[PDB]
C-alpha cells in the first residue's frame, strides 16, 4: 500500500505537538510516582490537585529544555540519532549534576 519510507510522520507529529497546548504525560501514573517519592521523607501526606499539575507542568518543561539542548548537541554531532552522553553533556553545562 502506501507504506511511506519515512520523514513525514515524525516531523508532522512535531508540527502537531507544537500546534498543541496541553500536557503529554497522563495523570494517574505520574501522580502515583509522585506519591512514591513522597512516601520517603515524611509519611502519609495529602495533596491538592493544583500542586500536582504544577509539578507536571514544570517537569515537562524541564525535560523539554533538556531535549532542546540535546537536539542541538546532536546537530553539532553531525547526527540525528541522539545519545545518552549528549544528555550528560547538557546537564554538565547546566551545572545540575
Amino acid at each position: 500500500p502506501h507504506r511511506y519510507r519515512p520523514g513525514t510522520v515524525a516531523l508532522r507529529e512535531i508540527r502537531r505537538y507544537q500546534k498543541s497546548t496541553e500536557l503529554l504525560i497522563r495523570k494517574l501514573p505520574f501522580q502515583r510516582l509522585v506519591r512514591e517519592i513522597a512516601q520517603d521523607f515524611k509519611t502519609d501526606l495529602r495533596f491538592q490537585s493544583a500542586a500536582i499539575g504544577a509539578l507536571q507542568e514544570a517537569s515537562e518543561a524541564y525535560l523539554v529544555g533538556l531535549f532542546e539542548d540535546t537536539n542541538l548537541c546532536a546537530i553539532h554531532a553531525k547526527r540525528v540519532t541522539i545519545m545518552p552522553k549528549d544528555i550528560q553533556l547538557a546537564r554538565r553545562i547546566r551545572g545540575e549534576r
Binding site: G7, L11, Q18, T21, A54, E57, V64, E68
Partner: protein, 105 residues
C-alpha cells in the same frame, strides 16, 4: 480629586503599595514619591507587554488571550525574553523550532 489614584491619573492603588512596603519589612520608613513611581513603572510594564499580547492573540482570530499567546509574545520579544530567561509559563510550550536539516528536500 480625593483619591491619590485620581491625583496620579493612573489605574493602580498607591496606598496599597505603600502598605505593602510597610507590611514588607522592606525599609523602616517609606517616602511619598517612591510608591507612585513604582506603580507607574508597573503600569507601563503591563501596558507594554499587553501590547504584544494583543497582537499575538490577534494573530489567530481569537478575542481571548491564552497562555500560549503570552509565551509566544514573550519569546518573540528580545528584552522580555532576556527578562524572563529563568521563567516558565503554565500551559506555555515553546516556539516552532524546525531545523533546516529536517524538511524533505
Amino acid at each position: 480629586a480625593k483619591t491619590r489614584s485620581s491625583r496620579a491619573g493612573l489605574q493602580f492603588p498607591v496606598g496599597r503599595v505603600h502598605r505593602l512596603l510597610r507590611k514588607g519589612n522592606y525599609s523602616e520608613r517609606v517616602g511619598a514619591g517612591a510608591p507612585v513611581y513604582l506603580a507607574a513603572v508597573l503600569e507601563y510594564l503591563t501596558a507594554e507587554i499587553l501590547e504584544l499580547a494583543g497582537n499575538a492573540a490577534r494573530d489567530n482570530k481569537k478575542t481571548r488571550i491564552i497562555p500560549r499567546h503570552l509565551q509566544l509574545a514573550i519569546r518573540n520579544d528580545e528584552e522580555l525574553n532576556k527578562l524572563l530567561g529563568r521563567v516558565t509559563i503554565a500551559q506555555g510550550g515553546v516556539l516552532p523550532n524546525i531545523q533546516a536539516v529536517l524538511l524533505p528536500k
